[PDB]
Enzyme design. Sequence first.
Site, PDB file in Angstrom:
ATOM      1  N   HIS B 575       0.826  -1.202   0.000  1.00 36.72           N
ATOM      2  CA  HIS B 575       0.000   0.000   0.000  1.00 36.72           C
ATOM      3  C   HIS B 575       0.864   1.258   0.000  1.00 36.72           C
ATOM      4  O   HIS B 575       0.528   2.265   0.627  1.00 36.72           O
ATOM      5  CB  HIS B 575      -0.953   0.004   1.192  1.00 36.72           C
ATOM      6  CG  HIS B 575      -1.867  -1.181   1.240  1.00 36.72           C
ATOM      7  ND1 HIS B 575      -1.757  -2.167   2.196  1.00 36.72           N
ATOM      8  CD2 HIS B 575      -2.907  -1.538   0.449  1.00 36.72           C
ATOM      9  CE1 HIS B 575      -2.690  -3.081   1.993  1.00 36.72           C
ATOM     10  NE2 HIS B 575      -3.400  -2.723   0.940  1.00 36.72           N
TER      11      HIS B 575
HETATM   12  C1  LIG Z   1      -0.616  -6.819  -4.852  1.00 36.76           C
HETATM   13  C2  LIG Z   1      -1.497  -5.619  -4.619  1.00 36.76           C
HETATM   14  C3  LIG Z   1      -2.664  -5.761  -3.876  1.00 36.76           C
HETATM   15  C4  LIG Z   1      -3.499  -4.670  -3.639  1.00 36.76           C
HETATM   16  N1  LIG Z   1      -4.651  -4.863  -2.897  1.00 36.76           N
HETATM   17  C5  LIG Z   1      -5.423  -3.835  -2.688  1.00 36.76           C
HETATM   18  C6  LIG Z   1      -6.628  -4.035  -1.908  1.00 36.76           C
HETATM   19  O1  LIG Z   1      -7.002  -5.097  -1.413  1.00 36.76           O
HETATM   20  N2  LIG Z   1      -7.377  -2.892  -1.743  1.00 36.76           N
HETATM   21  C7  LIG Z   1      -7.074  -1.639  -2.240  1.00 36.76           C
HETATM   22  O2  LIG Z   1      -7.848  -0.706  -2.004  1.00 36.76           O
HETATM   23  N3  LIG Z   1      -5.937  -1.458  -2.973  1.00 36.76           N
HETATM   24  C8  LIG Z   1      -5.162  -2.507  -3.179  1.00 36.76           C
HETATM   25  N4  LIG Z   1      -4.021  -2.336  -3.921  1.00 36.76           N
HETATM   26  C9  LIG Z   1      -3.711  -0.994  -4.432  1.00 36.76           C
HETATM   27  C10 LIG Z   1      -4.404  -0.674  -5.749  1.00 36.76           C
HETATM   28  O3  LIG Z   1      -3.787  -1.385  -6.822  1.00 36.76           O
HETATM   29  C11 LIG Z   1      -4.323   0.832  -6.012  1.00 36.76           C
HETATM   30  O4  LIG Z   1      -4.930   1.108  -7.269  1.00 36.76           O
HETATM   31  C12 LIG Z   1      -2.913   1.426  -6.014  1.00 36.76           C
HETATM   32  O5  LIG Z   1      -2.527   1.758  -4.680  1.00 36.76           O
HETATM   33  C13 LIG Z   1      -2.808   2.662  -6.883  1.00 36.76           C
HETATM   34  O6  LIG Z   1      -2.809   2.268  -8.270  1.00 36.76           O
HETATM   35  P1  LIG Z   1      -2.423   3.287  -9.407  1.00 36.76           P
HETATM   36  O7  LIG Z   1      -3.693   3.920  -9.985  1.00 36.76           O
HETATM   37  O8  LIG Z   1      -1.415   4.254  -8.916  1.00 36.76           O
HETATM   38  O9  LIG Z   1      -1.787   2.363 -10.526  1.00 36.76           O
HETATM   39  P2  LIG Z   1      -0.961   2.919 -11.760  1.00 36.76           P
HETATM   40  O10 LIG Z   1       0.431   3.207 -11.349  1.00 36.76           O
HETATM   41  O11 LIG Z   1      -1.727   4.110 -12.342  1.00 36.76           O
HETATM   42  O12 LIG Z   1      -0.966   1.720 -12.766  1.00 36.76           O
HETATM   43  C14 LIG Z   1       0.235   1.319 -13.456  1.00 36.76           C
HETATM   44  C15 LIG Z   1       0.080   1.628 -14.924  1.00 36.76           C
HETATM   45  O13 LIG Z   1       1.160   2.486 -15.359  1.00 36.76           O
HETATM   46  C16 LIG Z   1       1.735   1.959 -16.534  1.00 36.76           C
HETATM   47  N5  LIG Z   1       3.145   2.335 -16.574  1.00 36.76           N
HETATM   48  C17 LIG Z   1       4.023   2.378 -15.524  1.00 36.76           C
HETATM   49  N6  LIG Z   1       5.235   2.754 -15.855  1.00 36.76           N
HETATM   50  C18 LIG Z   1       5.148   2.973 -17.223  1.00 36.76           C
HETATM   51  C19 LIG Z   1       6.093   3.388 -18.180  1.00 36.76           C
HETATM   52  N7  LIG Z   1       7.368   3.670 -17.894  1.00 36.76           N
HETATM   53  N8  LIG Z   1       5.679   3.506 -19.461  1.00 36.76           N
HETATM   54  C20 LIG Z   1       4.407   3.226 -19.753  1.00 36.76           C
HETATM   55  N9  LIG Z   1       3.428   2.826 -18.938  1.00 36.76           N
HETATM   56  C21 LIG Z   1       3.866   2.717 -17.679  1.00 36.76           C
HETATM   57  C22 LIG Z   1       1.488   0.455 -16.473  1.00 36.76           C
HETATM   58  O14 LIG Z   1       1.510  -0.107 -17.780  1.00 36.76           O
HETATM   59  C23 LIG Z   1       0.089   0.411 -15.851  1.00 36.76           C
HETATM   60  O15 LIG Z   1      -0.938   0.509 -16.831  1.00 36.76           O
HETATM   61  C24 LIG Z   1      -3.155  -3.418  -4.168  1.00 36.76           C
HETATM   62  C25 LIG Z   1      -1.990  -3.272  -4.911  1.00 36.76           C
HETATM   63  C26 LIG Z   1      -1.156  -4.362  -5.142  1.00 36.76           C
HETATM   64  C27 LIG Z   1       0.099  -4.173  -5.951  1.00 36.76           C
END
Ligand SMILES: Cc1cc2nc3c(=O)[nH]c(=O)nc-3n(C[C@H](O)[C@H](O)[C@H](O)COP(=O)(O)OP(=O)(O)OC[C@H]3O[C@@H](n4cnc5c(N)ncnc54)[C@H](O)[C@@H]3O)c2cc1C
Lengths: 649, 649, 298
Positions: B575
């Site tokens: 997280h």
């Molecule tokens: C194992 C795990 C379990 C989780 N469990 C929970 C849970 O039970 N409950 C909860 O509320 N949250 C949970 N989370 C958190 C959840 O995933 C949230 O969404 C997270 O905290 C925030 O996601 P984000 O929108 O920042 O993802 P992002 O960072 O916006 O998604 C990554 C994206 O960026 C792209 N990207 C990255 N680098 C590059 C690059 N250099 N070039 C091109 N594209 C790139 C990837 O292709 C992908 O599409 C969990 C997370 C993980 C990893």
Amino acid sequence: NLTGDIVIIGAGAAGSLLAHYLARFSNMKIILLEAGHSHFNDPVVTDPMGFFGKYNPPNENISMSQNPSYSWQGAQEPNTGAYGNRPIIAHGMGFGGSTMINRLNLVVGGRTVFDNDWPVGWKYDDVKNYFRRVLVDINPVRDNTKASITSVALDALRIIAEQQIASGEPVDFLLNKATGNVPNVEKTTPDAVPLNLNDYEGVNSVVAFSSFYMGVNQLSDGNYIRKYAGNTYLNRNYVDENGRGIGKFSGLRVVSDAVVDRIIFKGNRAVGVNYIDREGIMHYVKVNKEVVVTSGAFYTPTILQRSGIGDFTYLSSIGVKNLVYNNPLVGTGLKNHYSPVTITRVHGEPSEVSRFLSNMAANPTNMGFKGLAELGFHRLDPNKPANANTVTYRKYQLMMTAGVGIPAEQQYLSGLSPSSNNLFTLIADDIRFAPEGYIKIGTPNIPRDVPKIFFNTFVTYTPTSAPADQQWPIAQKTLAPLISALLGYDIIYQTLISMNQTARDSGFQVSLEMVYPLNDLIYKLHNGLATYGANWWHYFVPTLVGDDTPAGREFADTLSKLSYYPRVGAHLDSHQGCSCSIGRTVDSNLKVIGTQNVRVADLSAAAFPPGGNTWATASMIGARAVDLILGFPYLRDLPVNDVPILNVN
Amino acid sequence: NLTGDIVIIGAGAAGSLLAHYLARFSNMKIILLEAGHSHFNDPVVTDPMGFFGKYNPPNENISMSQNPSYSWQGAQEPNTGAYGNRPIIAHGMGFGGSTMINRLNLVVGGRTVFDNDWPVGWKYDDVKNYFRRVLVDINPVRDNTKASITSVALDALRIIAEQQIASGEPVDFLLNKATGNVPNVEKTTPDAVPLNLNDYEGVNSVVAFSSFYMGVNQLSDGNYIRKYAGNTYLNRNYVDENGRGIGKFSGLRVVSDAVVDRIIFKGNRAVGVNYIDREGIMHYVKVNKEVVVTSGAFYTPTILQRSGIGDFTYLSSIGVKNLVYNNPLVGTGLKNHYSPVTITRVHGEPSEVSRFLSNMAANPTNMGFKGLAELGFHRLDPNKPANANTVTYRKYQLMMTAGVGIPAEQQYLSGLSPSSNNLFTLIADDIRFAPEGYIKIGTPNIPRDVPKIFFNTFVTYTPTSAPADQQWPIAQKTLAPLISALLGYDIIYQTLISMNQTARDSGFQVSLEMVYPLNDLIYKLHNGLATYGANWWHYFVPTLVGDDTPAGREFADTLSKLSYYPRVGAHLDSHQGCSCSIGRTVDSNLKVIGTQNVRVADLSAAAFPPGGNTWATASMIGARAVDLILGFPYLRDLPVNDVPILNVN
Amino acid sequence: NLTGDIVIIGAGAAGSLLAHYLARFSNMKIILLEAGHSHFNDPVVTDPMGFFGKYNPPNENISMSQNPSYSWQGAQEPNTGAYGNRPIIAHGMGFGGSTMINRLNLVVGGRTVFDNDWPVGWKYDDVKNYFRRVLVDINPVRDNTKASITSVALDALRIIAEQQIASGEPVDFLLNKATGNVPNVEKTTPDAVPLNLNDYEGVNSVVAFSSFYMGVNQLSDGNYIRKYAGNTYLNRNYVDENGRGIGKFSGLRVVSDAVVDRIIFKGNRAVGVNYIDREGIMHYVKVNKEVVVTSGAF
Ligand SMILES: Cc1cc2nc3c(=O)[nH]c(=O)nc-3n(C[C@H](O)[C@H](O)[C@H](O)COP(=O)(O)OP(=O)(O)OC[C@H]3O[C@@H](n4cnc5c(N)ncnc54)[C@H](O)[C@@H]3O)c2cc1C
Ligand SMILES: Cc1cc2nc3c(=O)[nH]c(=O)nc-3n(C[C@H](O)[C@H](O)[C@H](O)COP(=O)(O)OP(=O)(O)OC[C@H]3O[C@@H](n4cnc5c(N)ncnc54)[C@H](O)[C@@H]3O)c2cc1C
Ligand SMILES: Cc1cc2nc3c(=O)[nH]c(=O)nc-3n(C[C@H](O)[C@H](O)[C@H](O)COP(=O)(O)OP(=O)(O)OC[C@H]3O[C@@H](n4cnc5c(N)ncnc54)[C@H](O)[C@@H]3O)c2cc1C
């Protein structure tokens, strides 16, 4: 723009030597692309004590191997055979490759390791000159401060060796057949002849010596320097800050901080390679005649597969748009060692125990590597070569070290606080390690530090409802690493009891006993070995043998209990290689099968790991590749008195 | 070539919501970046139960977050508090980003976090509409299958809460100030409505409930499906195969296999972005109005450092050419939580203990955990804010799962069998973890899985030459995680000691004991806590307290040994966030400080970690960014009955 | 619109191979109409255990052959010889035809079955190369886990076979004339030579063996896959999601979810065929030179 008859990928342990001896011995235009940059004026690298962190910032006190600015971070998959953990191994990035962050020890490998396991045209008598060239070019130096412990250990191994010689057994771990009846052990006399473990004729397979040959030197000031590929083959005398050769090396044009993700093909021949500069923008490099890849053990399979050569089914599953050739062997069959560790504590009067361990401090001339011997096979080893009764192999490498080198959690659990000054370290490791792995990429876009790296070292055996004698060979093949580790422990125990008696004889009234492995277990293992014999490992599977006798069930409990040490009480040695062995991915000329003009000339193209540390193996490979690609034995004939002039800059 | 008025970096949770709700209310060109590929027909990701290894091959049974072809492997630098281990946190790589690999659990985090720990304009009364919109868009479903231990735990905690509220203590871990002195526990009577933890008005901060919420979706057949952010907001019901939407979604286009390199600047304003495809050709997409960089709390700061925003000295030394704006605090203060595991043992006749632990299997509507409550800070913790006595917080997270969740090495050392049903896990997740870290880049050539990421959790204290009266605050602030973990241990012990008698009253003739943490040690901890009251924490350092009582030495030893378990008998949840928090790199309107038209909408922009799971917070940030960049409040007042629709094919 | 020199009806067990080896080996424009669609990323089909229902929804737990979305439902008339019941048989609908729902077993048929019952120009010596081509293209694999029951059974049939050979009767069910006096039975030795029932020369008519050749494969992961016509002859390497060939197969233009109800004639020659698309509206396809029908048995 930026053409080249020969294009070299990466200035690793073999890339620098290849570029040097290729630009000097020919007249073609050569261009080298390296992901790292020169560290000739970096105190962390040049100073041998930089390995222990003498120049780290206070808030970023991390090791040089754990620094992503110095090395690749090859995090591995969870290990079923290592209690589900994810250790991380590294490859040094920069000139010289992984020789910038190693512990500066050189071993040639031996005679049998090249005579038996290697294919035709590759035996020791063909690479002797290349090995000698590499060794004289490095020009290593032995240890300078001699200690009292080493002589006592040498006489102990001498007594054990003469007893084993008088025994008459077929093969043991102090039996050198090429020497004769006289034991192959150094002399404890102060004026003894310094015995070498890297003899030019390869007469020393298993033998006890006094010191190795560090890759260091002493300067006129008195400061010690680190000697490796970067400051031996590509100094300021040949290449300037603009990356251009001078003199007869003017055909070379090296580019630093250049990582190449793919080799472009015309269907069966390479026409160009592309890289990304420090601006973060791409660049194009045109290849004229051949492409050379020197990307190291873990990363030549990735560059080969991502460029379009490899298993077409799995590559298509990944999404590789351009496909070239189909082998089910690209990236398979890699090897690495493993170093179990033991700790011995001396009990006695404070003065005697302070004097016994004299001359042990970490010094740049030894780096704590006093060393004892390159031990061989055990008497109870089931997994031995069929022709073992004809030649002697190398299996163990016994080396002594000061302090207590063990992970911190195990240090706290076992209570071996480094504050105690009555203990030392000796390491016995396996050089013919059995378990094997595989590397597969996950994205066909760029070389990443973390591919699918599956490596299970010490797996168990699950008995089935089948006849025991029908399945026993399978169990014996599977349970090899645990057998080797426990045999190493028994060898250390015999060496330790000989140490105790010899030290009591030599005027020091002290006693040395094992404390770390919970000596009860080691003594019970020795008793079980003595009382059982060749079938000692049958109780590794308790329900299969079904002895169900108090001694038998107690030995089964001991074997299950002692298997935790080889799994957790050590750290993995970073000597990986041989992932593209000859015949699997390349032929005897180090050229790719089915392709026309691509060559790979590093440790990744080795048939089998040597019987020792693999510093000289990569360079040697390059040396051989120099005259394979030029076509004449130019390098192998050059006299012994020719070394590149060493420039500190 | 492409043109885009507003560019969103990273097709993740907040990124997909941003893209859909921005193309919804306008028709300007919008481009969303994502480097993986589609996963709409993959059973492992589409089926919610595939998170636990439903269709994993037997030979390579690993978690989906541990697979390099599914997610980035962002290994961190060694943790000085846990024997130098390096946990690996992953970011998803595909449509929906990290929403493809998670548990889909939905938690808001209460109101006090946005009442005191967030700046002006970010208070709960302003973001509650966005939180409600996210909750109704996801449309979770409550648990259906019921065990028979949740009622026992609820009754025991009810007894404890009644005793504590009748005691009249100033602050404790079971008192809520927004409801009253009546204990807030879910009634065991079968005619009680459930009290959700995600109330629109946030009435409950510490609340005892029966289950959690999850973002699964229902099919006509009866099979359960996963509707993640990339599946809720970017599925084929709205965007075609080529990329060109129809009608009111025609302004949105999604690119595939696009991994970025750097955002090109014209001195202070975004002018374009670039990426490299499978072939290895860079495409220049020019940006017209604004760039939103929300690619993750681990790689958005990386691309910002490559952009030239951070430390000028470090970037110049590393080799970054263009410097745009110097900010020493960029990518600093990284925040994440921590959770230690424990094991509880059931004693009694086999039949009664078997029926006691029945109906406790993971399904698409429980995810293994049953869940009890989210308690607050304890009665003896010296680490509290001033507002504690006037409003309650959310400090701990307690869950119960079947089987045993504990490292295999820890399983062997503790000797607790995994096959036995009688053991269940009682974990107290801490959502108010103290320490913070920062991120730096290693090599400015290509994106890499492992940059420099630092995080120290269990920083111990060392005595220094200073009076104790002027030293004790330093020891208080330095050792917060250990105090929190030990108080959580005591909370679990109290819960189980009450649940013993509660289960005895309920009918089951069983006794439950706290086995894995060495119940003797936990009993000693509770006794010492009760004995020493508010001054117990002084005994962690034995030399400072200056009391040579044998009971004091025993208590200090008990405190010392109990510190070992949180380092190894735990797991660091993924997280992570709060790297570019509000007020350091961005301001209240999310504009990056220093540049002109750049905004960060990821989870790293959080001003404080909410008391729970973090998908809802990131979705809220993206939703707020929608209206901040749009200029008009459309989403703030959208009707609840207006929701998106999903399409499997 | 939508003309074609050769029009192929249905991508059955032979339709896919016909389209592939016809588009590759010629230069005419070929168009194929199939009622089903590709199931290359359907876990029920690829996983061999999907036959036993490992991915069925809880409230629709039915077999893949009984699912009208996967196969035709050929309900039969009441059977006078089977006590007046109406069993239902199915034909797999989609790429590969009925090879998507079968139990993945391959048999070649033998030598006599083609030598006697088949007309001139059709005997085994004329189809041997085609059979070998098909078998090597599928590339099947035997069984890996060997059991104790099989050896006991093999020795039992060996004893029965040698007794029947010593009997001297004209023909029995363990008598292989092409082998000789030695019984045609596998050996119970652990190191026995694996005997094949699909020998290239057709010397094994009646013989006891240890395993057949499943239409499966083992992957690098360790997962097993289903090998059939669809994933052997018409993969993504040849036809894209738009149903167009690539490379030397660019003359092929396959249309999925297309059922043809009638072939239009000019009195004695075919001029066009018509189908109905997924919109539920009809369509016209014009035939240039010949019409090919691969609609299966029923
Ligand atoms: C194992 C795990 C379990 C989780 N469990 C929970 C849970 O039970 N409950 C909860 O509320 N949250 C949970 N989370 C958190 C959840 O995933 C949230 O969404 C997270 O905290 C925030 O996601 P984000 O929108 O920042 O993802 P992002 O960072 O916006 O998604 C990554 C994206 O960026 C792209 N990207 C990255 N680098 C590059 C690059 N250099 N070039 C091109 N594209 C790139 C990837 O292709 C992908 O599409 C969990 C997370 C993980 C990893
Ligand atoms: C801590 C430690 C101690 C060691 N101690 C010893 C010892 O005592 N004795 C011993 O013999 N060995 C020792 N080793 C091992 C030794 O350092 C190497 O294993 C040995 O040099 C063989 O590897 P290599 O040099 O061929 O690999 P390398 O040449 O180091 O492989 C990596 C090289 O390839 C380049 N490269 C890779 N991919 C790319 C790419 N895509 N583009 C451009 N360039 C690329 C890198 O820049 C680098 O130069 C030790 C290793 C470690 C980590
Ligand atoms: C449960 C089961 C197990 C089996 N096991 C085995 C086994 O172990 N070994 C074995 O050899 N055989 C086995 N079979 C039989 C095997 O699957 C087929 O019988 C075999 O492939 C021969 O049939 P076919 O493929 O030519 O028919 P098909 O090609 O399957 O006939 C139907 C095809 O024609 C197409 N079609 C039909 N009418 C139209 C139309 N109007 N318009 C468009 N397309 C149309 C359909 O789309 C489909 O592709 C099994 C069958 C079943 C049901």
